[PDB]
Amino acid sequence: RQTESDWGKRCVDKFDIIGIIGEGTYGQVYKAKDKDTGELVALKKVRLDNEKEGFPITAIREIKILRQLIHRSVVNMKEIVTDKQDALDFKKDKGAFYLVFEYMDHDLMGLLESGLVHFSEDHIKSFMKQLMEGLEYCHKKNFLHRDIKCSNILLNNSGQIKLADFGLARLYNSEESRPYTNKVITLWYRPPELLLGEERYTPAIDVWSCGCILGELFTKKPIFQANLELAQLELISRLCGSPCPAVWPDVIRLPYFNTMKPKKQYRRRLREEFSFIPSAALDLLDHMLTLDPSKRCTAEQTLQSDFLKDVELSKMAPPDLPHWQDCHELWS
Amino acid sequence: MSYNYVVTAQKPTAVNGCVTGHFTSAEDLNLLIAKNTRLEIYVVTAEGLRPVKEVGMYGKIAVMELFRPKGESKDLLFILTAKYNACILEYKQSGESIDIITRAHGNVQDRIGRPSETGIIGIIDPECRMIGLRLYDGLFKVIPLDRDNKELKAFNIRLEELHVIDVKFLYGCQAPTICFVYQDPQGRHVKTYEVSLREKEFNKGPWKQENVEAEASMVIAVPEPFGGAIIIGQESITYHNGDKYLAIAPPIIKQSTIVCHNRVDPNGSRYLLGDMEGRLFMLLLEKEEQMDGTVTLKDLRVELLGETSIAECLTYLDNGVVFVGSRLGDSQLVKLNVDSNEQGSYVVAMETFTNLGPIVDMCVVDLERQGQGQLVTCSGAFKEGSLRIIRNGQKLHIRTVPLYESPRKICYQEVSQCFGVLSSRIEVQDTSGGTTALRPSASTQALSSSVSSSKLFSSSTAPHETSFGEEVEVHNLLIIDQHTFEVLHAHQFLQNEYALSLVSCKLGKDPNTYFIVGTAMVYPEEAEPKQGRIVVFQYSDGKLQTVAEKEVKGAVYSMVEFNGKLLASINSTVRLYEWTTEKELRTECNHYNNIMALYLKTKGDFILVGDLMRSVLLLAYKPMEGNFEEIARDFNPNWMSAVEILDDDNFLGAENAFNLFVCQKDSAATTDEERQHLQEVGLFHLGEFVNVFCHGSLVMQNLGETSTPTQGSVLFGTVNGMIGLVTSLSESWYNLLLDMQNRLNKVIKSVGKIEHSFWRSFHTERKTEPATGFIDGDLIESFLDISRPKMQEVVANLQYDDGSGMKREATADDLIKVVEELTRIH
Amino acid sequence: TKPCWYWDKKDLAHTPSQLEGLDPATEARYRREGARFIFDVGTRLGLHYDTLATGIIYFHRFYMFHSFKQFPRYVTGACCLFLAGKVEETPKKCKDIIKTARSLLNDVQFGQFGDDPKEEVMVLERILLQTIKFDLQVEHPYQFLLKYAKQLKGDKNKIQKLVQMAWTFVNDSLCTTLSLQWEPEIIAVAVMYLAGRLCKFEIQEWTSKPMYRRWWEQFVQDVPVDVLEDICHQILDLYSQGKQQMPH
C-alpha cells in the first residue's frame, strides 16, 4: 500500500520510449524501458483531450476488468502514468495518461505470419493449455474478451503464454441481458452467431476463436479466410456444416438467419478435412468449432480434454526457432 | 501511393528439372528443360541439342512430366506450379507456326492442408490412368486421367503415414500401386498401397513394409523386366520387390550424399546416380534368368564414372550423351565412354551451358572506365563457385572466373585496383586431427597468404570434440585483381569463424582505404553465435596487414559505411563505431529493438534495417544528440532476404516467399503515429529469391540523360541466376502501363490458361493479396511480339488522361515506340 | 498491490478540512449535503443504486485527501456521479448531470459550478481519478445484505421486513463516514443486526446454525459486537438528530 498502490502520480518521464510495436484495440502500443529499474514495458496512450465524455469509458472498462484479473496467462497491468502535470494549473492541464503493461518477447501474429517458428504437437499443448487456463479464469469472473486474435496472444521465450488487450472486453450477465455489438471479432476468427447478428452473446465467442487458432497451429494457415461476412459464413459452413435448425434450434431466432444463407446446406466435413490432426486434438477442434453456442464446449471442458487434461506446465515448451537457416536457406 | 516498374535483365538460368520423351512429334527425341517459370524444348541430335521452342508460364514449375495415354500419337506434358496451378499441354506445329495447346487446366489447392517438408511430389501411372500428387501431410491427391476431366478435378485419399519422403508409381502391378518411403518415430520404412479409382481409397498393397535406412532419400521405380523398387540412402542401396531383398552398401557412396537418379537402359539394367561433390556413378542391375524363363536380380553394382557438375537432375540422351542439369554450377553435356581416359575417367565434357547459379552478392563497377557499368557476381556453390563479370553488349557478355570454392560477399576497392571477396571451402576432419581439403581452390592457390593469429577467443581451454570425417567450413578473404582476376592474396580466418560482412572504405581522418570484415564464431551447440569480430585490414604492396580488431558479442551479419563511421549489426544490435586517431574502433551509439538485424542500408543520416520477422525499420543518427532514434517501421510482419532504399521516402524489400514490397512514409503528418507507420504501398510476387539489391545500371552511357520515362535503377540477383531491375514511375506513366496491362492480359494467351493477375498476387502460405504499385515490365515488353491485330485490339479505345491535359487517344505505333524506349533500360 | 481505504474514527479529526478551520459538525453536514445531492440527482436520472453509492464513496474518499473549502462540495459530487456512471456501466452525459443539478440546487448553490459548469466538473475528473488512485472497483453493502438474506429461511414476510428495513439503513449510512471506517460486509451485517433489534426478530433461528447466538459470525468472520454496536449507534444518530422515527 505504501508504494505501488499509488497510481497516476508518476510521470512518463520515468520511461524512455523505444518506439511503437503494433496496433491494439483502440490505440497503438509502444515499447519503453524504465529508467530506474531498466525493465521493458508496453504502453497504450489514453488521451483526455476530447471532452465529450472526458475520460474514455472504454479505457475505464479496460482498467476495471484488468485490475481484477490476476493470472499467469493474463497480461498484468503494472501501473498508470501521466504526462508532465502543471502545478497549481490543474484546470488548464491537458495532459494525457498512459497505461503500463508488462513486455513479452514475441507475439503470435509475428511468429506465424513470417513462418519462421514451428509448433510441435507438444508445443501446441503448452500453448493451448495456458491460453484456456487464462480464458477460463476470465470466463469464471464473467468477463468476455471480444478480440481474440494472434496479435493479442503474446509469448515469452520461456514458453509462457499470456492474453493481452482487454479494451474490447465487457462483462457478461446470464440473468440480465444488455445488447452488445454484432461485429466484435476479427472476421477470420468470428463466431457464427455474431455473424448471424446475435447481439447478446455467450462467452463461447472466445472458445470459437481459440478453436480456429488450434487448427491454424496445425495447418499453418488460418482456417477461415474471407473478406466479407457472408463469404466467411459460407467457408464456415463448408467445414463445420451449414447452420440448420437440427444442429442449432435457435438459429431461427437470430436476426439474419433467413437473410444470410449458404449456397447449399453443406454437411460437416471437419473430421475428414482435418484427418492429419491427432485424434486427441481433432475431437477438441470438433467441439470447439461447434455451430450452436449452446453446444460449443466451455473453456473448462477444453482443460478436461484428452489433449490438454494431462499436460504439465512443468514441461513448458517454447516454439522452435531456426538458426543458420535464417541467414541462408540451406543449399543442401 | 508509390509507382514502380520491374523487368528481367537475365532470365533464370538454373535448371530445376529435365525430362526426355516424344513431346513435339511421336518421332523426335525431345529434352524438356525446366528453369524457374521457363520451359525450354530441345530436339536431340547426334551433335547435341537443337532448340525448337521456349515458353514462359505464370508460375514456378514444380512438377513437369511427360506421358502418353492410349489413343494419343505423342507424349503430353503435365505441369503443376508452386501455387497449385495444374495443366496438361500439347505441342502443335503448323509449318512455321509453333504453338503449345492447353488441353486441361485447374487449381488443385485444398482449403485445409499442411504443406509437406519434402515438397510437392508429382508422379504418373505407367498406364497413364491417373496423376498422383503429394501436396499435404496425411493426404494423397488423385487426378484421374479420363477424357472428360478437362477441368482436372481430383479427390483426396486419407494417408495414415503423415511424413512421406518420396513416392513413385510401381511397375508390373495388377492395379495402380504406389511405393513410398515414410518416417515415423521408429525410423524410416518403405510401404506400398494400391490405388482404386472406383472405390476412391487405398487397398492393401502388394508387398510388405520393411524397415529401411534412416537417411533414405529417393524411390526408384524399376521397369517391368525386374519390377519392384530401389531405395537410395546415404550409405546403403536396397532393392525391394515382394520377398526378394538385395542391399549393397558400397564404401564410395558414403563419402557424398546422392541427390539425383536416372535410368539409362529401359530394361532397368543400368541407372545413373549423382552426389554433391559432382561424382557420377552407374548403378548396374545384374540379371539372373531362371530356367522358368523369369528374370531375377543377381546383385547390385555401383561403378564410378567421373566428375560432373553438382547436378539437380541427370537425364540420359541416347548414344551415350547425358545432360547434367545443375542449380549450383554450369549445366553440361557429357560423353560416357566405354574406355576410360588416361586419368581413369569415362566422362568427357562436350558443352557447357552458363548458369549464373546462386547469386549470393554482387557489385556494380565500371572496370574498363567506359562509363558503361559491369556486374561482378559471387555465383555458384562449392566446386562450382565462381565470379562472373557481366556486361551489356543484343546479348549479355559474361566472363567466368572459377574459384572452386563457395563465394559469399564481394566489394570493390578502387585504390587497390582489386576486389575483396569472402569465401568458404569445405575440409573434412582427417586422421592427423586437423582437416584436409577435397580439392584445391582459390583460397589455397593464392599468390601470398596469411592466417589470423588473433588471441581474442583463445579463452576456451579445451577444444570442442572433433571426430574424423566431419565437414567444416574454412573462411577466407580473397584479394583478386580487377584486370586478371588472379588471386593475389588469401587471408584465412580463425577456426570456426565465419565471414559474413565485407566493406571497402576510408574512416574518420584516416587517409588509408581499408578492407573491413565482420565475423561470427560459430559452434554447433550455439543457437545464435555469441562471439564475433570486426577486423580492419589494409591491402598494401601485395600483403594484407591486420590493422585493428574489435571484439563483439555476436555475429556481424552486415556492415555499411555511414558518414565516415562504421555501421554494424551484431545479432539484435545495430551499432555505430567511430575510427579514432589511434586506429581503433570506438562505440558511439546503439539500437536494440530488433530480433536479428540481418540487412542494413543507408542514405544520408537515415538507416534502413531488415529484420528476420519484423520487416523494415527506419533509423536516424540524430547528430546533435548522438543516439539512434526510431523514425518509422513496417508493422506487417515479413521475413526478409534483401532490402534497398529507393529514395528518401520509398523503401524496397524482398520476402523469403518470393515476394517484393515497397514501404513509404505516410506523407500525411496528421498524428505522430501516421508518420511512424511505414505503409506497404507496393506488393508484387516476383517468383525468385532475391539475395542482393544493388544500385546501378549496366547500360552503355554516352551522355544519355533524362530521355527515359523511368527514374532510378536498382539491380538484383537471385538464387536461380535471374538478374532483375526495379525502377520508379510517375503517376501518369504508371496508369498508362497499368491500364495497358489489363488489356494485354485479355489479349495474350497464357500457357495453361494461368491468370496473370493471380500469378503476381502477393502470396504466402497465410496470405494472398492482389499486386499493387508494380508494373510487370516483362508483360509490357511482350507488346512488341504480339501480332499486329492483337496490338490494335490492345490500343483500341485507349485514352491517356495523364493530367495537365485532357484524355488523349492512343495509337499503336506510338505505343510500340514507348515500349522500345522502355527496352533500353536493360 | 491495492490501496487501503479504511481509517479509524479518531483519524477524522485530522481531515484536511478539519485542519483548515472547519469544525466537525460542519464537515459532516457538508458530507450529508453532498452525498444526498449525489443521491437525489442520480435518482432523477434513473440511476441504479450501485451507481449512486459508487459516486458517494468516491466523494467520501475524496474529502479524506482534499479540503471542502478548496474544492466545492456539489461540483465534486457531480464529478463523482459522472465517473461512477462510467465505472458501473450506467453512463450519463455530463450536460445531463449539470442540467439536473440546477433543478435540484438553488442559485447560490449552483454558483459553485461557475460560469461554465461542465468544464469545472470535467476538469476535476483528472484530480478525482488520481485521488482515488484509479481504484475504481467498489463493493457495497447491498450485495451482502442480499447474499446473507438469501441464506435465511423462515417466515417470508418477517425476513422481507428485515431486508427492507436494513436496505433503508444502508441508504442512510451513505450520508456518513461509515463507508470509510468499515468494510461493506460489516455494514450489511450491522444493518441486519440493527433491523433485528428494532423488529424484535432473533435472526439465528433463520440460519443453518439456529443455536449459534452470534449469527453473523458465519457471514463475516472476526466481527465483535463492539463494532456492530458502534455502527448501529452512528446510524440511529442520524435519525435522532433529524428526530424522524425508525422506519419500522
Ligand SMILES: Cn1cc(-n2cnc3c(NCc4nc5cc(Cl)c(Cl)cc5[nH]4)nc(N4CCOCC4)nc32)cn1
Ligand atoms: C494490451 N497489451 C498489449 C501488451 N503487450 C505487451 N507486450 C507486447 C508485445 N510484445 C511482443 C512484440 N511484438 C513486436 C513487434 C514489433 Cl514490430 C516490435 Cl518492434 C516489437 C515487438 N514486441 N506485442 C504486442 N503486440 C502489439 C501489437 O502488435 C502485436 C504485438 N503487445 C504487447 C500489453 N498490454
